[PDB]
Amino acid sequence: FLGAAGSTMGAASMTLTVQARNLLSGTVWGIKQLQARVLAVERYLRDQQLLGIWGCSGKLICCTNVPWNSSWSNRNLSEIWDNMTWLQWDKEISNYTQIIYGLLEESQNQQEKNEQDLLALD
Amino acid sequence: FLGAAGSTMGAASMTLTVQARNLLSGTVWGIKQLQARVLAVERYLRDQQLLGIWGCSGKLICCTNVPWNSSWSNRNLSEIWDNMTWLQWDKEISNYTQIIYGLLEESQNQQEKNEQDLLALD
Amino acid sequence: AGLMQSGAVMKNSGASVRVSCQADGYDFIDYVIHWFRQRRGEGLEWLGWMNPSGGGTNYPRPFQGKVTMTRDTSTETAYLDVRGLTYDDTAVYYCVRDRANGSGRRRFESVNWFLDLWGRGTQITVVSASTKGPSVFPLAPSSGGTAALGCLVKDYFPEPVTVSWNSGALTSGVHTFPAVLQSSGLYSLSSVVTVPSSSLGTQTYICNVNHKPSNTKVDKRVEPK
Amino acid sequence: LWVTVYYGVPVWKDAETTLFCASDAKAYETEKHNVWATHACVPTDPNPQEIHLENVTEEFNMWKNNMVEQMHTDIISLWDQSLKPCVKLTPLCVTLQCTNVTNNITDDMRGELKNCSFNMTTELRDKKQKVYSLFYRLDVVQINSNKEYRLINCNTSAITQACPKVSFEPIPIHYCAPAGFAILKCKDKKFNGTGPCPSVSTVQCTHGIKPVVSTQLLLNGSLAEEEVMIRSENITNNAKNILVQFNTPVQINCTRPNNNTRKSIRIGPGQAFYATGDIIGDIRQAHCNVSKATWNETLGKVVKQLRKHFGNNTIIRFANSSGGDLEVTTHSFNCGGEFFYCNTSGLFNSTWISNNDSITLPCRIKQIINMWQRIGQAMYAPPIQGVIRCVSNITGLILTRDGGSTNSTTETFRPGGGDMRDNWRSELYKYKVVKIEPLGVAPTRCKRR
Amino acid sequence: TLQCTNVTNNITDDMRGELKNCSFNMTTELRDKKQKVYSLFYRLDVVQ
Amino acid sequence: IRSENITNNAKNILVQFNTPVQINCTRPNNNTRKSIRIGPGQAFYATG
Amino acid sequence: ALTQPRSVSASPGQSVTISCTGTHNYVSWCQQKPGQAPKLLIYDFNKRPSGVSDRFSGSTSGNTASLTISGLQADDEGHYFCWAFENIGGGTKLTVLGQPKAAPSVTLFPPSSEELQANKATLVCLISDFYPGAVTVAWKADSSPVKAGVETTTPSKQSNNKYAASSYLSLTPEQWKSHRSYSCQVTHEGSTVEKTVAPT
């Protein structure tokens, strides 16, 4: 569980299976943990929604029909899976996450599933 | 967001991507908006369930192995994507939605996935 | 909003007194109070502080036991006490609110202590009692810069005091400076004229004064020798 | 390179949520209806479930923390709860013909307790009820005549009587978080509360914690380990109270040494009052005893552990408090239900340089609190017959630095406190709440169909 | 019960009485003592 | 102007202005307050 | 125990520094308009918060720490001070440059021979017609300054707006015979002025 976030990305890639395990794992003062469990569920579902509206939905890992952007911190192939970590990446990435999402959720499946319709007919 | 429900169906088809965007978008008197968010989640999930039990589940659009019924208001191909709107359709459709559902949820995947098993074996 | 300093006040050597900082516009209980003092032309000084929660305080080493600062939560008021007064305690006294320290979730947070809200101050003046009609002394000219002289008046109480020049007949080149609180707890000032150099010997000069709180009018003939 | 996302990634950030308790199982069985207040608190994971973390360091801030204030709002909430149905006391703000004592108990216990007598509502409405009871000096006040007094609260704040079935025993509570939220757990022993902590685990069900209630003195708390620890948000700020944690348990034995008797006064229906009766035999003041030389050596290792900040040679001195309310001016606390205030004056009249019986300091008992400045309601601490004795460990302290404006000449300390939240920070020093996001995307030369 | 009266100031019949200067006993802080007191009220808060 | 069916006189009529009407109201007397002490805690507030 | 000048003066709409010096601790700055509650300005060596004019610019350089001011507005006449925890600055009376740098006039007068007949030696130093009303004053017996029993006023309005003030030394007549070159010494705007009396 979250075993070694300080291990590099290529090492950490081996299992993505326990952080997704205990992430659900099965009166006033009694109202509260209800109010907490409910948004834990909402966060899980916001996730699964942002996921399904991407070509992903297929759990955990998912290749995608959009590449990279130079300016988005031009770096190298061995410099990150072998020399970096996760937050280490997303703190940098904080500055561009939004339009990343925006282009996935639009320019992908919407085009992709409409093109699919254009062949799911013949 | 719900931009022009009065634009015809073929025009409206272009994007089905923002009505599904803000549809979740991320003490007494404090109990209430909890009671509201919860059934918003249930409505979303009732949807996704009615969806997955159909061959659909694949988000937004989904072709299906059942055709039309004459009596269900015989009309034409250009009369609806070019000359009608959404509620405009479903107010008519109110009178037949139920067995539509009934036949999808049964006569489809149940047959379809069992036939699939009959080939997912060899 | 702000804070309510009681008005200025006189008392006496030794003795003791109490001073009030009333708080309006927020949370008396949250935040913390401090007190400060400026003496006769002096770099301001710290006095002490109180967290109005439990009541805990900290008196700096040289003022421990001297001071007694307190609170009343219900009246939402801050209080201070000072004992065995001396002239060296003649000053003006501020209470003052810090927001960056004290109980409650609301904290603006700063490394330096916040002196957010300020009481107007309370001037404390220790005047040894009775009154005493003053004592006038002549300051004469002598040995350029044209001649000048006056009469001082000393160790009296209370101010003010009238000084006139030949029943106040002359008012050309006169100034009557502010009083001064000597250590003694009493006051002293002086009235001055300047004159030509030949204006001596011929034209001569005296002081009219009166301290009518003691009912004491005085005429003194000022003479350079 | 294309893009590809990952669900379950190791990334989180600074967030604070609502959290829930956990009170294990063996506490659950003791028959007699309700406990502490954990009514629906769910038992503890019976196994230590923690994960050490490899090459990770991030920054804990014990004052910028939150779960401390979570537990604070929680405990004043359940404070309100606890007594909410308990018995009211409105017919006690009544005149009180009183007097002192009649037994050979020295001026050491002269009067102080009072033998008041007065009328009262009966079970019914008509009849009055001439009665009498005994009270600590600090529950009563003169009014300008023989000896008629008032209770302290009756010009400020009404008062309810705690249900006697309640017991004031702190019980280890495991605060446990929801998912998506993790608790980073610092695991070095040298972490002055602020900054990044390398040695860390990840945890959800924090250890069993007793919310000990005391001023100046910290009781039954957690240990430090090798080199006793001290923490300040910025000690140069003298006003920032200093919180210290011991590696060494201080033995303390407190005792209220008189055999009391209880009165189920009948101010009925239903609502029954509980008064003090006359005392069995001799009368002696409550107090506490502590091992002299262990005290000596702990304050040694302390004064060793401070001049690091204030020059290896500085003048140290301690003293009794700067004058506060009885809660902060003394070691206020509870033992066995009733409430002590100990004259901690005796343990600080000392001055420290550079590198036999046992101590008996007395405490006086009070029954009328309105704690956390939560006035508008007071609690009557009901009596307990028999005597009271109290084993405790002392593990930390709250202190105040004098601001002796010099350079680093003489610096002197006193037992601070007042703000109760520190007794929580003093076991919250080691935790941080983090919101994890299982999502993380990376470019890579991978295509879809 | 409320031993009352009208007004004492030059304020015309335009404001004649209407406000009332009632006087009466009251609970103290304590339970025993009564509390002879008095207060002023608009005419529509009171009744003969 | 709006009515559920104004011919129904009993249906109250609700009207909305395009024009703001200036109005200045004043209770023109300087009052004084009494923290009466019917304690504990509960303090009354009377007219002086 | 912080520095801060004795007084500063400048024309409106200009740009002025106020320095205070002690330690690398976090200074902050505040404002005494006369007969007005102090009004805190900048916290933590640089940043101004809510309801404050941008014109104020605090900075530091370690131990020293100063405040630059944009656009001198005379509605900001008065005293200014810095602090750093219990260590405090000694006030700074910023006046504005209205009228000319008025050199003061200093007069030293001896003890009346009648004071000597009442055995209390009283010496006076008097400062007149000066501006800006912002001066400091030390005494000098023979060749030595003094700590005992010195009082000094706060300058104020003469008739002609310019300023007036007084220093009183109380010594006993033998203490006044014992040093001969008794003397008063003032500092007005850097310029240091003296006058002297001897027992005669």
Ligand SMILES: *[C@@H]1O[C@H](CO)[C@@H](O[C@@H]2O[C@H](CO)[C@@H](O[C@@H]3O[C@H](CO[C@H]4O[C@H](CO)[C@@H](O)[C@H](O[C@H]5O[C@H](CO)[C@@H](O)[C@H](O)[C@@H]5O[C@H]5O[C@H](CO)[C@@H](O)[C@H](O)[C@@H]5O)[C@@H]4O)[C@@H](O)[C@H](O[C@H]4O[C@H](CO)[C@@H](O)[C@H](O)[C@@H]4O)[C@@H]3O)[C@H](O)[C@H]2NC(C)=O)[C@H](O)[C@H]1NC(C)=O
């Ligand atoms: C916190 O710290 C304070 C301060 O120290 C403690 O206060 C102490 O409290 C205890 C009890 O509360 C007090 O004990 C009493 O002592 C008196 C006087 O005894 C003296 O004189 C006789 C001769 O006249 C000596 O023989 C006594 O020697 C006793 O001690 C020595 C060792 O030092 C021991 O070897 C002796 O045998 C003797 O002990 C007892 O011996 C037998 C059994 O061994 C026993 O039958 C006998 O009674 C002795 O107690 C001593 O020098 C003594 O009279 C008292 O007993 C009687 O009266 C009480 C009251 O009615 C009865 O209950 C009891 O049964 C006896 O009838 C007590 O024993 C002590 O004086 C006091 N002060 C000091 C300085 O110790 C607190 O108790 C501490 N509290 C906590 C929580 O830590």
Ligand SMILES: *[C@@H]1O[C@H](CO)[C@@H](O[C@@H]2O[C@H](CO)[C@@H](O[C@@H]3O[C@H](CO[C@H]4O[C@H](CO)[C@@H](O)[C@H](O[C@H]5O[C@H](CO)[C@@H](O)[C@H](O)[C@@H]5O[C@H]5O[C@H](CO)[C@@H](O)[C@H](O)[C@@H]5O)[C@@H]4O)[C@@H](O)[C@H](O[C@H]4O[C@H](CO)[C@@H](O)[C@H](O)[C@@H]4O)[C@@H]3O)[C@H](O)[C@H]2NC(C)=O)[C@H](O)[C@H]1NC(C)=O
């Ligand atoms: C709602 O509508 C009602 C009805 O209109 C208002 O009721 C009015 O209320 C105001 C105040 O509440 C009343 O004002 C008072 O007027 C009296 C009488 O003044 C008359 O006689 C003198 C000579 O005897 C005239 O000079 C006066 O002329 C005044 O008005 C003219 C313009 O019309 C002006 O040019 C004059 O200068 C003069 O005004 C004032 O002048 C100077 C400064 O300019 C000032 O120092 C002076 O006192 C004048 O007030 C006028 O014809 C007057 O005596 C009162 O003043 C004194 O008594 C009160 C009570 O102690 C003091 O507070 C005050 O300081 C004075 O000592 C008042 O000013 C007015 O009569 C009354 N009725 C009418 C018809 O206006 C409500 O106020 C309205 N409320 C709201 C919320 O809208």
Ligand SMILES: *[C@@H]1O[C@H](CO)[C@@H](O[C@@H]2O[C@H](CO)[C@@H](O[C@@H]3O[C@H](CO)[C@@H](O)[C@H](O)[C@@H]3O)[C@H](O)[C@H]2NC(C)=O)[C@H](O)[C@H]1NC(C)=O
């Ligand atoms: C606390 O004060 C109460 C007063 O209400 C004391 O109770 C009363 O105490 C007096 C003596 O102080 C008792 O008087 C005697 O009573 C006995 C038995 O009735 C009788 O034989 C004697 O002739 C004399 O009248 C009185 O009865 C008693 N009453 C009650 C109801 O207790 C109480 O003793 C005081 N307690 C202490 C510890 O001081």
Ligand SMILES: *[C@@H]1O[C@H](CO)[C@@H](O[C@@H]2O[C@H](CO)[C@@H](O[C@@H]3O[C@H](CO)[C@@H](O)[C@H](O)[C@@H]3O)[C@H](O)[C@H]2NC(C)=O)[C@H](O)[C@H]1NC(C)=O
């Ligand atoms: C710190 O921990 C110690 C160790 O337990 C606590 O001492 C305990 O004190 C309580 C009363 O405050 C005792 O409770 C009572 O125990 C007796 C007999 O054990 C029983 O008759 C009562 O019904 C009640 O349960 C408790 O027993 C005692 N601990 C032990 C092991 O005996 C101490 O209270 C703790 N600190 C604080 C401030 O409470």
Ligand SMILES: *[C@@H]1O[C@H](CO)[C@@H](O[C@@H]2O[C@H](CO)[C@@H](O[C@@H]3O[C@H](CO)[C@@H](O)[C@H](O)[C@@H]3O)[C@H](O)[C@H]2NC(C)=O)[C@H](O)[C@H]1NC(C)=O
């Ligand atoms: C902290 O310690 C100081 C000194 O170490 C204590 O100071 C003392 O304060 C008390 C009460 O203000 C003074 O007491 C008076 O004593 C007479 C004769 O015994 C008594 O009859 C009076 O009723 C009064 O209580 C005492 O003179 C004074 N100085 C000393 C040396 O004791 C202070 O009480 C301590 N405070 C705390 C909270 O620990």
Ligand SMILES: *[C@@H]1O[C@H](CO)[C@@H](O[C@@H]2O[C@H](CO)[C@@H](O[C@@H]3O[C@H](CO)[C@@H](O)[C@H](O)[C@@H]3O)[C@H](O)[C@H]2NC(C)=O)[C@H](O)[C@H]1NC(C)=O
């Ligand atoms: C409303 O009614 C109350 C009655 O409770 C008035 O209070 C009382 O008013 C009378 C005069 O109407 C006061 O009498 C005089 O008192 C002064 C000072 O004590 C004394 O010098 C006179 O010889 C005479 O006795 C009385 O003291 C006063 N009492 C109190 C407690 O206020 C009140 O004035 C009435 N208010 C209005 C606006 O009508």
Ligand SMILES: *[C@@H]1O[C@H](CO)[C@@H](O[C@@H]2O[C@H](CO)[C@@H](O)[C@H](O)[C@H]2NC(C)=O)[C@H](O)[C@H]1NC(C)=O
């Ligand atoms: C309890 O009530 C009794 C009455 O039953 C009180 O006794 C009276 O006290 C008053 C004092 O003001 C006397 O004037 C009466 O003469 C007493 N006797 C009666 C009324 O029969 C007694 O003082 C009350 N005790 C309290 C309130 O503590």
Ligand SMILES: *[C@@H]1O[C@H](CO)[C@@H](O[C@@H]2O[C@H](CO)[C@@H](O)[C@H](O)[C@H]2NC(C)=O)[C@H](O)[C@H]1NC(C)=O
């Ligand atoms: C007070 O401190 C003592 C230290 O001797 C504690 O005794 C230890 O208790 C822990 C847990 O209960 C055990 O793991 C240790 O082995 C005990 N020490 C020894 C020497 O056996 C005692 O429990 C503490 N009491 C409290 C905190 O109430």
Ligand SMILES: *[C@@H]1O[C@H](CO)[C@@H](O[C@@H]2O[C@H](CO)[C@@H](O)[C@H](O)[C@H]2NC(C)=O)[C@H](O)[C@H]1NC(C)=O
């Ligand atoms: C405190 O006083 C009570 C009442 O006198 C004592 O209770 C008695 O105790 C003895 C001895 O334990 C028993 O034989 C009696 O049956 C008890 N009676 C009642 C009514 O409780 C109590 O024991 C005293 N405290 C101590 C420590 O002995």
Ligand SMILES: *[C@@H]1O[C@H](CO)[C@@H](O[C@@H]2O[C@H](CO)[C@@H](O)[C@H](O)[C@H]2NC(C)=O)[C@H](O)[C@H]1NC(C)=O
């Ligand atoms: C506090 O109480 C404990 C237990 O009552 C004391 O410890 C005992 O100490 C004696 C000698 O002082 C030993 O003979 C016992 O074996 C100890 N027993 C236990 C359980 O600890 C301790 O000394 C007391 N301390 C003070 C200062 O009173």
Ligand SMILES: *[C@@H]1O[C@H](CO)[C@@H](O[C@@H]2O[C@H](CO)[C@@H](O)[C@H](O)[C@H]2NC(C)=O)[C@H](O)[C@H]1NC(C)=O
């Ligand atoms: C706590 O203890 C100290 C001393 O142990 C008490 O101080 C004494 O106070 C009395 C009050 O009359 C004085 O007469 C004594 O002279 C004081 N002691 C000394 C050594 O001077 C103190 O009052 C106690 N109580 C509190 C609340 O601090």
Ligand SMILES: *[C@@H]1O[C@H](CO)[C@@H](O[C@@H]2O[C@H](CO)[C@@H](O)[C@H](O)[C@H]2NC(C)=O)[C@H](O)[C@H]1NC(C)=O
């Ligand atoms: C202050 O600390 C000293 C310890 O250095 C205490 O000293 C005592 O002095 C008295 C007489 O002067 C002796 O009878 C005691 O035996 C001494 N005790 C100790 C431990 O040395 C002194 O009592 C302390 N002050 C107070 C108020 O307790």
Ligand SMILES: *[C@@H]1O[C@H](CO)[C@@H](O[C@@H]2O[C@H](CO)[C@@H](O)[C@H](O)[C@H]2NC(C)=O)[C@H](O)[C@H]1NC(C)=O
């Ligand atoms: C307030 O209480 C007083 C008593 O303190 C009342 O005065 C009594 O009024 C009754 C009227 O029925 C008379 O019979 C008594 O003789 C009065 N004097 C007494 C009892 O000493 C007064 O009327 C009360 N005022 C109210 C209720 O408004």
Ligand SMILES: *[C@@H]1O[C@H](CO)[C@@H](O[C@@H]2O[C@H](CO)[C@@H](O)[C@H](O)[C@H]2NC(C)=O)[C@H](O)[C@H]1NC(C)=O
């Ligand atoms: C209403 O009456 C009160 C009480 O007399 C006035 O309060 C005083 O107001 C003056 C002038 O503003 C101040 O100098 C006093 O210090 C105030 N005293 C108190 C106790 O409040 C009030 O001003 C009056 N209303 C108006 C509008 O002036």
Ligand SMILES: *[C@@H]1O[C@H](CO)[C@@H](O)[C@H](O)[C@H]1NC(C)=O
């Ligand atoms: C990539 O980022 C750069 C920023 O330098 C921007 O100019 C470019 O348009 C981005 N790529 C696309 C496809 O928008």
Ligand SMILES: *[C@@H]1O[C@H](CO)[C@@H](O)[C@H](O)[C@H]1NC(C)=O
């Ligand atoms: C990154 O790769 C480029 C070639 O694409 C190479 O020239 C450069 O040295 C590499 N640098 C790092 C830090 O990997």
